[PDB]
Write a protein that binds this ligand. Structure first.
Ligand SMILES: [Zn+2]
Ligand SMILES: [Zn+2]
Lengths: 49, 397, 397, 397, 397
């Protein structure tokens, strides 16, 4: 991540995300807890991105 | 297919223009092209092998793009790159080889492998570039249809053929008349012999002729034509036509008389040369016809007269000959020649991996057998296979 | 002239780098160059032909241009382009061919055709580009009056010459001494024969010598020198010097004694090799001198002794020989060789279009005749004509 | 070293892509690279020569840059440039030559000259660029240690060797049996002779064999194999093994029986061909073994029967032979061949400047001597020296 | 590879510099390095063995670091450490052994095992350090390209060879002349015998010569040369050359006359010594040539005269000899010698685990067979395998 922001994106990520491909992000980050059983059901974790 | 090409000039114009030293800007137009690739790739998976002693390695992708740290590259930049290229190298090899073995009668002019059938896919076309490699240059022009063309030194157009034809013979083989020859590669040697030295022949002249039909037309051929066939200028003991016995050939050489070489195309004389030895040009032909004569010497010193009596036994056999060599030529079809390694590359990869004989090519990719029955299917497969060998040689020799 | 060149690498580096797919920025530096041309052209009229069986197709100009958008290239982009290139292709062909026939005693080194005389014009100069094609690279360096240079595998420096010289002879031709040879292309074979096997010669040794004068200096030559002349190792019936009769040659071969090869330049020995067979280097020479001897064997087994009596008749003729082949060399003047198609291209275009014999070149562009009298005019015309053939082969083979 | 390379493709891709006309943009990526150089240089001082008849020359630097301004290129721009290039040309020449003579046992690989030892310096590395020149492409890969490779037409792998081996002989040399051959360059000719025509041999067959051990492995070889050894098909008077007398060879040729060619690698058969004449592929080998037989004809016409009596004297000597030519092949080590001028360039520069014999190379860079004892030191020095010759030929031929 | 090295000097310079007491600061620079490792490891699983009697032990990682706090190490600190080292020890052993058997004809110089192929990985190189162990010092320099070099004692360059050559013999073997020798390891003993004591020899002197060709060049050799070959100074009954009978050798020793030892390199004399016994230096050679003579004593006391009659039977056989021993030398290639345990380590591990014969090494790692056909593949594999043995011996003997 650091290596991205501190250097702007080329969308490499944009493409991988778009043709919806398996990918990871390294480093520190926020983080949000949630207890909504339902939530999971509305695959929220697939949003934000 | 064209896809494949790029993948290489990509790497060569890469593993070459990328060194510890050059300024970025000398590769800006290059870096770009490169990355573009990486993207399209990562994700999709590939299978190679699955035949004879050919390993089946599975290739998967996952790579980060390329920095830019201005003002000439720092060593550290290279290594983190070479490490990413060496996966593509060791890859492509395993890719070429896989489609460099499969053959197909019906449509054996197109992709066969589970590796390539996926490359011609559309989502990949986004790569093609710098098509200056003589072979691809010609692959394309062929898909649209037009005057293609290749360059060969000492081309390999003549299937090996070494034989004779006795026009006059008898059981004892003591008074023969005929021709013997060797057609092989780019060379022809032919001798006409007359044991009687034309003693009873009209005008004391015996006519000879040798015709060679090429399996493909050659254009713009530079040819050396010389009198005499050294190969048939020495004493020989030869098997008879029926294999039942052996005859004796004891040549004495005379200059070929009224030499005429014709380079014909579809029965028409395109070039004709009368007694011209040295370098001659044959611009377009599918057949060569060599006509020459043995003329009994009208005046003979005693030593000569003694070789040619009026009656048998004929112990010195009058012989006249010609030697013709195609130094260079252009052919619209791929051929083996004395400089290109294509045939050897294809043949070598198949031999090394114990690839089973297929339905198209003769066992061992035998050149004589191949050129003797150079069918459209063999040519399309040969061209595909030669083009791949040439793509491979840009990186792996 | 230099103009002409561009017109091609323009198209090749074009018909090659423009394919359904590729990223634009690999051609930005290219597209530009291209357009520039179109402009300069549009608004000009041209004429080709008007000689022998050569059409007289006429051409006009008025074309569009090209986008500078699109990250990647869409098929539609190509076709609307290929259609515009195919007019330049079919054009240039008709252009090369037109100036590839006209010869001029005077300034045969300059432009001739109504097509080209207009190209050297100044308003066209705004087009030159990428001159790395071995031939143009050399054209320029020459116009600037400087040291040229070329590459040839098995060059064609020796005009065909096959003859003999009898140093000792008599009417019966039963006790001759002399040499016979074949100089052709890049090869020389020479044999020295002495029917008497040096029986009455001082030190029982007969000296031989063969000198060959090149019409142009060859530098950096890699040469194969081998003992024996296979071509003159077999029985022959030959015409006498005056053509009045025929003599008999019945060779038996001995090793050439005291072999010395000298490569001279303007009378000076530049390289000399004493009995060294195999690969030798001759770095700069205009003459080759081969000296060798026949030495009567001082000790002979009965079978050998029987071949060489003290008195005539001499029935086995002692022969010693040498074979020399120039594998590669550099020449400051264009020459035909065993790999390049230039001579064949020029000769072929002239033959196909029934071009009449002109004032400079021998009938049929005959190589032997050309190299035998390689005048400055023939060389300047040959170079112009070879350079054009090479420009043409970048697009049309 | 890699340094050196650039200095050239710099100039070529320069003296070529820069002329009265063209748009800036097609060289923008080029101009830059160029300047970068000038800078690094200016101030630094050099020295070349000082060995044998080699001129010692000192050079300094202090030059202007380039108008990265203008759109087009006006004549005036060129001239003010060519004048600056012609100092680098005449320079590099004097540079190559200087390091193209020094040899060294220990580190025969690395640089030698006071000119180059300063180039490998770090502050100069700021210059590498476009390494598609077949030779550099291979120099690098050799440092990183990996499978390299080169392309050769009629290669030069066989040191000259012309001899014989008498397997059965006697003082009179009237009933011999053995083989004679010529190994040279890329060709082998070998003949097996039996004066008795296998009259007392088991199955009336005499076996022959010829083994040739290459000093380096050849891969992907395209080979021509033909029956008969023309070189040993004519009458000869030869010196005896001990040099005390001479014997007579009077051959009559029969077809070689049970021909088997084996291309071995470390004692293992990699390729084997049984009686296959024409074009064959040997994919990886360090040894060639040719086995062939003379089989007494079971059926003979009178003329033939007369040549082969049951008792001596044996006057016609039965001979069978083979001819093998390596048209092309790949070698991991540099070698001389029939097309490349490297050996000739190195040998020529040394000869022209009267360079004294050194500790590594044989006198005169003699190829036979070199390949016969092709030590690691000779190969490393040869490669360094060949790579430099190739860098030089990009500018000076 | 280099990776592997560290893993050890890590442990040695560890299991050595860590003892109950030592003041911390002797290891600060050490502790660090250590930890760094642990990190890189933990989390990656490993696999070894899988052939013959080689167990397939599996491994895992998850270890606490090492409190760099304390000023003086307390016993408790050690034990909690030794327990963590003993997993790496018992590990590395199982690692070395695994790659100390696998062999490859092609790239038999690089890593093979599923254990090591993963070590050369990039994420691991974060470890390398302190490469002073003679062997690694040399591994690198070789991977980098330069004059390597190892140190020996009574090296093992001569494959065992014990034989004779009879230059004059007859069925009864009662008047022989020839040489017999023993070449083995670093020693050569050769004797020249003449049953006739040069009675009929020119100048009453019989010349002898013994040539030994090394498979690798030895440099900086300290050699002992002594007159006489004790091994061939006693009575023997020997088998005849054809094995059909036995001959009697009854030597009487005389001083070798005109002794000349030449140490040649590629046919050139590098060092020559005339009759110099004791210690001599041969600085660079690939061949040793020993020439010596037997000179019949011109003056003989009765007792001596009685041994050498003018006529047979010859009952006392005059013999002269030499003994040469290479005490120490340097070789650019690994070799077995009289001090290093490498060959024995490799051979022993393979024997203990019943490792099957592979494609590279001779059965049992037989030294004579190995050095006799010391191919590049055997040398690369031997060096890899010797370097690993040396890494192992730093911890396990
Ligand atoms: Zn050739
Ligand atoms: Zn000791």
């Amino acid at each position: 991540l650091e290596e991205l922001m501190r250097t702007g994106d080329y969308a490499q990520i944009t493409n991988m995300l778009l043709n919806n491909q398996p990918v990871a992000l390294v480093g520190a980050l926020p983080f949000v807890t949630d207890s909504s059983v339902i939530s999971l059901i509305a695959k929220l974790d697939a949003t934000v991105f | 297919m064209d896809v494949l090409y790029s993948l290489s000039k990509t790497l060569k114009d890469a593993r070459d223009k990328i060194v510890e030293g050059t300024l970025y800007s000398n590769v800006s137009d290059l870096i770009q092209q490169f990355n573009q690739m990486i993207i399209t790739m990562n994700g999709n998976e590939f299978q190679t092998g699955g035949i004879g002693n050919l390993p089946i390695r599975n290739w998967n992708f996952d790579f980060g793009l390329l920095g830019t740290t201005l003002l000439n590259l720092d060593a550290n930049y290279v290594e983190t790159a070479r490490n990413t290229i060496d996966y593509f190298v060791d890859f492509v090899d395993n890719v070429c080889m896989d489609e460099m073995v499969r053959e197909s009668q019906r449509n054996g002019i197109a992709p066969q492998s589970d590796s390539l059938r996926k490359l011609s896919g559309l989502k990949f076309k986004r790569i093609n570039f710098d098509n200056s490699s003589e072979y691809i240059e010609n692959w394309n022009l062929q898909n649209r249809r037009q005057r293609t063309g290749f360059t060969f030194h000492k081309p390999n157009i003549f299937p090996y053929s070494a034989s004779f034809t006795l026009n006059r013979s008898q059981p004892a083989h003591d008074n023969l008349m005929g021709t013997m020859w060797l057609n092989a590669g780019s060379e022809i040697q032919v001798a006409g012999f007359d044991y009687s030295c034309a003693i009873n022949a009209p005008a004391n002249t015996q006519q000879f002729e040798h015709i060679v039909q090429l399996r493909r037309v050659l254009t713009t051929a530079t040819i050396t034509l010389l009198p005499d066939a050294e190969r048939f200028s020495f004493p020989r003991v030869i098997n008879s036509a029926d294999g039942a016995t052996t005859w004796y050939f004891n040549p004495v050489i005379l200059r070929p008389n009224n030499v005429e070489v014709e380079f014909l195309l579809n029965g028409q004389i395109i070039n004709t040369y009368q007694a011209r030895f040295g370098t001659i040009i044959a611009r377009n032909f599918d057949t060569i016809r060599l006509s020459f004569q043995l003329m009994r010497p009208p005046n003979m010193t005693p030593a000569v007269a003694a070789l040619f009596p009026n009656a048998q036994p004929f112990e010195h056999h009058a012989t006249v000959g010609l030697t013709l060599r195609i130094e260079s030529a252009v052919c619209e079809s791929v051929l083996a020649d004395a400089s290109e390694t294509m045939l050897a590359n294809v043949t070598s990869v198949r031999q090394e991996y114990a690839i089973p004989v297929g339905p198209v090519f003769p066992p061992g990719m035998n050149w004589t057998d191949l050129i003797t029955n150079y069918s459209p299917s063999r040519e399309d497969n040969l061209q595909r296979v030669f083009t791949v060998a040439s793509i491979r040689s840009m990186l792996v020799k």
